[PDB]
Design an enzyme around this catalytic site. Sequence first.
Site, mmCIF file in Angstrom:
data_model
loop_
_atom_site.group_PDB
_atom_site.id
_atom_site.type_symbol
_atom_site.label_atom_id
_atom_site.label_comp_id
_atom_site.label_asym_id
_atom_site.label_seq_id
_atom_site.Cartn_x
_atom_site.Cartn_y
_atom_site.Cartn_z
ATOM 1 N N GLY A 128 -11.666 -13.533 -18.757
ATOM 2 C CA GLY A 128 -12.472 -14.343 -19.283
ATOM 3 C C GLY A 128 -14.313 -14.200 -19.643
ATOM 4 O O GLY A 128 -14.762 -13.750 -18.635
ATOM 5 N N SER B 258 -7.879 -14.654 -13.816
ATOM 6 C CA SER B 258 -7.409 -14.149 -12.538
ATOM 7 C C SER B 258 -7.199 -12.219 -12.834
ATOM 8 O O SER B 258 -7.502 -11.670 -12.938
ATOM 9 C CB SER B 258 -6.850 -14.816 -11.162
ATOM 10 O OG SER B 258 -5.767 -15.474 -11.997
ATOM 11 N N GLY B 259 -5.256 -11.761 -12.506
ATOM 12 C CA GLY B 259 -5.108 -12.277 -10.471
ATOM 13 C C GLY B 259 -3.824 -13.094 -10.871
ATOM 14 O O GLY B 259 -2.667 -13.472 -10.370
ATOM 15 N N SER C 99 -10.655 -8.384 -10.345
ATOM 16 C CA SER C 99 -10.191 -8.771 -10.995
ATOM 17 C C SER C 99 -10.641 -7.306 -12.466
ATOM 18 O O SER C 99 -11.055 -6.967 -12.235
ATOM 19 C CB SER C 99 -12.091 -9.700 -12.024
ATOM 20 O OG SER C 99 -12.073 -10.005 -13.089
ATOM 21 N N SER C 100 -10.448 -8.125 -13.680
ATOM 22 C CA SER C 100 -10.166 -6.783 -14.832
ATOM 23 C C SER C 100 -12.138 -6.178 -15.467
ATOM 24 O O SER C 100 -12.297 -7.829 -16.144
ATOM 25 C CB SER C 100 -9.131 -6.895 -15.241
ATOM 26 O OG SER C 100 -9.024 -7.482 -16.391
ATOM 27 N N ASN D 222 -12.713 -13.762 -7.684
ATOM 28 C CA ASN D 222 -11.474 -13.218 -7.545
ATOM 29 C C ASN D 222 -11.733 -11.917 -6.660
ATOM 30 O O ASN D 222 -13.114 -11.223 -7.068
ATOM 31 C CB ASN D 222 -10.652 -12.961 -8.730
ATOM 32 C CG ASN D 222 -8.918 -13.142 -8.652
ATOM 33 O OD1 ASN D 222 -9.027 -12.974 -7.169
ATOM 34 N ND2 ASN D 222 -8.913 -12.951 -9.594
ATOM 35 N N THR E 88 -0.260 -10.349 -16.674
ATOM 36 C CA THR E 88 -0.087 -8.581 -17.193
ATOM 37 C C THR E 88 1.259 -9.084 -16.249
ATOM 38 O O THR E 88 2.195 -8.477 -17.211
ATOM 39 C CB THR E 88 -0.146 -7.454 -16.831
ATOM 40 O OG1 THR E 88 -1.654 -7.253 -16.141
ATOM 41 C CG2 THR E 88 0.215 -6.384 -15.947
ATOM 42 N N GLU F 53 -17.368 -15.841 -18.307
ATOM 43 C CA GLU F 53 -17.821 -15.765 -16.636
ATOM 44 C C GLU F 53 -18.333 -16.563 -15.734
ATOM 45 O O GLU F 53 -19.923 -16.879 -17.429
ATOM 46 C CB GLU F 53 -17.522 -14.522 -15.667
ATOM 47 C CG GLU F 53 -16.943 -13.803 -15.310
ATOM 48 C CD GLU F 53 -16.719 -12.203 -14.889
ATOM 49 O OE1 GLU F 53 -17.424 -11.965 -14.877
ATOM 50 O OE2 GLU F 53 -15.713 -11.606 -14.455
#
Lengths: 374, 374, 637
Positions: free
Chosen positions: C322, C51-52, C100-101, C97, C56, C324
């Site tokens: 991560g 996530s989310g 998402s990064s 999400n 961080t 996916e």
Amino acid sequence: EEEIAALVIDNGSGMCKAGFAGDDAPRAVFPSIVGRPRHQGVMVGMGQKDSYVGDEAQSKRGILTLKYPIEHGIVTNWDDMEKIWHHTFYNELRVAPEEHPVLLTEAPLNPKANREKMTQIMFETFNTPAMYVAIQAVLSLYASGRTTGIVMDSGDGVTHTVPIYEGYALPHAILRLDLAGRDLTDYLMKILTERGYSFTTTAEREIVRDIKEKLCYVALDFEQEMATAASSSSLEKSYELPDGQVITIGNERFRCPEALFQPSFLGMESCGIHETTFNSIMKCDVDIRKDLYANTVLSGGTTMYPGIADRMQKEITALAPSTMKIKIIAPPERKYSVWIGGSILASLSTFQQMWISKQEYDESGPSIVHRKCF
Amino acid sequence: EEEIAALVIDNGSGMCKAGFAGDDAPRAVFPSIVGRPRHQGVMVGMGQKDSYVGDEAQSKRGILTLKYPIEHGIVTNWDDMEKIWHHTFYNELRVAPEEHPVLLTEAPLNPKANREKMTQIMFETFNTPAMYVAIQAVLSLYASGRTTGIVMDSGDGVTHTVPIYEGYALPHAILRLDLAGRDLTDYLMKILTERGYSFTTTAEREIVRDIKEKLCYVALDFEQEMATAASSSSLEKSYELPDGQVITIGNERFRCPEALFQPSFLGMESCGIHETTFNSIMKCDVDIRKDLYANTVLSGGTTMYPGIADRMQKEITALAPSTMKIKIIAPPERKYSVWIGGSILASLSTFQQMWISKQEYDESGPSIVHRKCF
Amino acid sequence: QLPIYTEAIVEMYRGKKRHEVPPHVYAVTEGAYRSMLQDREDQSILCTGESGAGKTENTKKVIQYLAHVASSGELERQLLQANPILEAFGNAKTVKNDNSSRFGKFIRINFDVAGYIVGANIETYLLEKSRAIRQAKDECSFHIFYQLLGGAGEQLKADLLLEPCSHYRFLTNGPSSSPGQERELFQETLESLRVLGFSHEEIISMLRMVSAVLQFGNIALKRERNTDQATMPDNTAAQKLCRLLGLGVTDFSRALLTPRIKVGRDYVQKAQTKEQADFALEALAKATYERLFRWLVLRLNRALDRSPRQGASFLGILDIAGFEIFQLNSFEQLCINYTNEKLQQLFNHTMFVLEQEEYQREGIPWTFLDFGLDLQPCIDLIERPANPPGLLALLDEECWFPKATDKSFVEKVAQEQGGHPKFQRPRHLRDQADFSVLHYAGKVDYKANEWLMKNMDPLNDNVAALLHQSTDRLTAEIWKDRPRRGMFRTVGQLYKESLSRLMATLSNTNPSFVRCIVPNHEKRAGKLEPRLVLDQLRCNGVLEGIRICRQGFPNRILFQEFRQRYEILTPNAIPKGFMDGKQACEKMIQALELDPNLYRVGQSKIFFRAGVLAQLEEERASEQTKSDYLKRANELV
Ligand SMILES: Nc1ncnc2c1ncn2[C@@H]1O[C@H](COP(=O)(O)OP(=O)(O)O)[C@@H](O)[C@H]1O
Ligand SMILES: Nc1ncnc2c1ncn2[C@@H]1O[C@H](COP(=O)(O)OP(=O)(O)O)[C@@H](O)[C@H]1O
Ligand SMILES: [Mg+2]
Ligand SMILES: [Mg+2]
């Protein structure tokens, strides 16, 4: 699902006509050809694809040498046939044959080995619950929706003739004549050569097949039409080759199908098709003939030529007693008659018990084809 | 590093086009010339430098006699060729060929000895891990990004013609015509002489090569343009020599390239280039021609002349069936097409297994060139 | 919000081993910090995509620990401010999400030999730049695009000449609302930039190029009758582009359509197809975006201030998405998987060295295969360029070769590489996805559609040069550029390279590992969805970690503990008390009848397999049953 549907495949030489049982037309119909790259390719990131099957081959014709795996209703090369079937199921229909019973067509008087080996494949190549192998002519008779008739079956493979009365069937009376669309094609490319056009290779052999499939027609009297070839007007037709060359074919057009009625042209003694029909009918009991004369059904690709019905009518009537009227029933959509017949047969409820079951085969072996089915 | 890069060299006569595989243009392109000091020098602290190679020779032209080591795609003199390659690797690219696989181009129908001996050099002169020798035309077809076409390849060496369909390749159809940029040059210096300008020596032979590389153009109809030469206005052009002399060339301009279409001018029977293209296409199977007419690719230096494409279009269309449209695809940047093709081929992953390996050569000898590659 | 993360807790953690206290981040990061002062070598913290999750946010807590330990002006509070920036540019709304990064975030905290903070910088390795051009069926592109669209007023929109979502070709799936009202978020983000100390001018410039990338869509190339080259009959769009940059329309038009290339030393034009030029447009879009992003990171690190530089060492913190899995799984999905593969491999190797060194510390010599090798064939399947070539390599080969179709690609890879055990062709009925591979996580299915198109990123050097000459400061400064650069250059290749840089950087250091899981969609505690946790355990490699340690001797117990605790097991074996505690274990293991494969004798401990202690514990509950019975009976009678 209920009934599971069923699968139907017509393989006389030339075309595979396949689709789901229970439908009025087949989904996939494509030429039964296995083309192989004869010329060694030089690039990188080609194919390689050892060979091409179905109308793929038609598309990429020039490179390939094409080999028809079926000749005269006999499979010459089995792996090729297997490849064609593979293509039908996976490439077109997208079915797992495990999930469907499959019906195959097959020609009369045909070697045992083909039926037996055919079944051997269907069970031990494409795992399948059940299958049946059926005579081509009967199927077309069903498709025509008549119980009685003498079915004149000529595909590209071979020509066949099976009289039927009120269902039943007459083994002694069944006739099989070695002429076909393919033999007409071979004749036709021969006859072109007298005009200058020379077609020496499998690729363009199919081009002449295409020409025949439209330009050729059957004379309502051969000699009259050949006489009128003197003053060439309508009998010539321009044809466009894929090369861009133009061909112009006169009398040569209609004498091509004439061969069916005059196999002396081809050099065979075997009587013409109309005489073979007489040969069949004459073998039958005196009683039933009346309706066979009146119920002649034409099937298969190589009855498609315009005017064949009329010529057959004129010849049969000429030969036979004019005491009884000779109707010939030749539907349009005849080309697909076998496949339609297959569709209707697998759709029939009672038929659903006559299948050759996988189980039965596993116990009793491949030889059981003849034991159970005709 | 990953993949090691790879090296690519195009040597048709006249120019070496070399650079790294995996780039859109070659780094070094220079004339394949070995000039030798013909006149004995008298100073001290000159050179001496037994000979000069590459555009060095162009710079110091007057003193040297130039010898093109390749004629008609054949290497006349091997040590010279080796010197040229030496110059490419060390003088321009600054690579150790031990650290790169190298691709060489080579013309079709060309003597075996050239391929074999070429490989012999690459292994036993510049120690190199692997190499390949490839047909010029195919490479340009790749560079054009088309899978099918008839590639008209005319460099300075010789002219070549290789029809290709869907990859594949037709050996019988491949045509090789003895005309070139160099023959045009020889013709051109001949034709100037009628105007008074006399170019007798190798030095100034390259001056006329330079002229031809710009001033000459091909007529969209030869006779019309020659007729309009009567009233000379646009057809004359002033050219400046390095000497400072000025040349003025009229109709003589465009009839130079006309030779490609009328080799009778040169005195050879061999048909013009357009007819040779027809000779190729006509050798091919009837089926594929349609796209070959439509996919003609021009490559090589001596297709650069303005208006060649148009003339070829008009002539081919005139000769062929107008039933099918004849597109000719002639890119600008065609000059470099072979080298680009080489770049793309060595870039290809799968190709990385087709290399002739040093190891393989050491076991099997030089003769293996034909065995493995086309 | 948990009461955790006070000062007492952190102080409490200090200078202790991980087992000594309860599990916590502060512990593992303590491990890193201690290993650095101790080992004087750099450390890395891997957080796996979740996530989310507030990965961080957690990492802020890690920094909080770091501050309190290292002393001797608050912490970099702007690190909080950085999130929305990188979030806005970097992240997109996806099926898994809404935020998402895509890009990896590497946060370097720089430490002197004294152990104090010299400063910090951010590094951003992998980006999915292909997301900007191309997108999933039901997903959104990066946040900034949308928040720009709704967020900017006429004040800014009029400068940028932004339009609604329907106008742009490069924006897939329409507006795809999404709001959220938006616009407010954009407003927040502007302030977030401003406090960081970027000028309004700079912001406007940035937003202008963000328009520019989108504008690359509005250009339409029209194929011409008969000729290859194609062209651009409508000047309006590219005129707009030229306003938005330094480019002269004519210059750009020639350059794009018919570029010039250096064939040394003398330039020559090129013919370009419609398709080729389209890819070039998409390339410059994508490369432009990437460049922009890079500049933001560097300019950001300038907005971060450091004390005396170059001293001495750092602690990297990696935040990346991560492993996916979607139902469909396109190309980007494959790249992500590839990276997660390598990261996982590093973890295995790390674990491997830990166990190998642990054995020596206990004096047990044992040789066993590298755990990293498990992943290696899968990696080679995707990567390996040469002998058998990899999926990426083969894709690249497909892309360049003339008439390439997706179908020819899959067929080719089957033919080329199907013998690979981790590669599986489904065959037969669908099986919608056209080929599959077997990762650590499990079997994933891939759809090959439009892979060739996604892979193409040919870049015109001519247009690039024009950018390098741009009039405006911003873009020209950006384009302030070896490989196969120009044409060739594929997204797969660049991605691979970028990952190689990252793997080198991480590989230089000593990594440490944190795995984040979300219990539920609810955004509330007291609800753990086992299926979701299973899924997460698959993609973070934790399952792989358990299947790794099982191969070794996971259970490690001291002699003393083993004897004191389990003595009840075997009254017979255990003597009168010779003691020394080795002999005890010798006796116990001996009479308990255990295979020598299933244990080892170490200095302070005995190493055990999985299930050995399960049997022994069953003999303790059986033994306890016998003793409960004997006791209770004796008391009764
Ligand atoms: N439209 C047509 N007109 C005339 N002849 C045709 C036509 N179509 C096919 N044929 C001929 O009939 C042949 C096809 O027969 P087909 O029905 O496929 O036989 P089978 O069912 O036994 O395979 C072709 O090879 C061709 O010679
Ligand atoms: N710009 C030009 N215009 C016209 N003709 C040219 C031009 N450049 C080169 N040529 C001709 O083509 C030749 C170069 O051919 P090239 O491509 O080097 O052949 P290869 O690739 O086989 O070595 C020159 O010798 C010249 O005759
Ligand atoms: Mg038939
Ligand atoms: Mg050449």
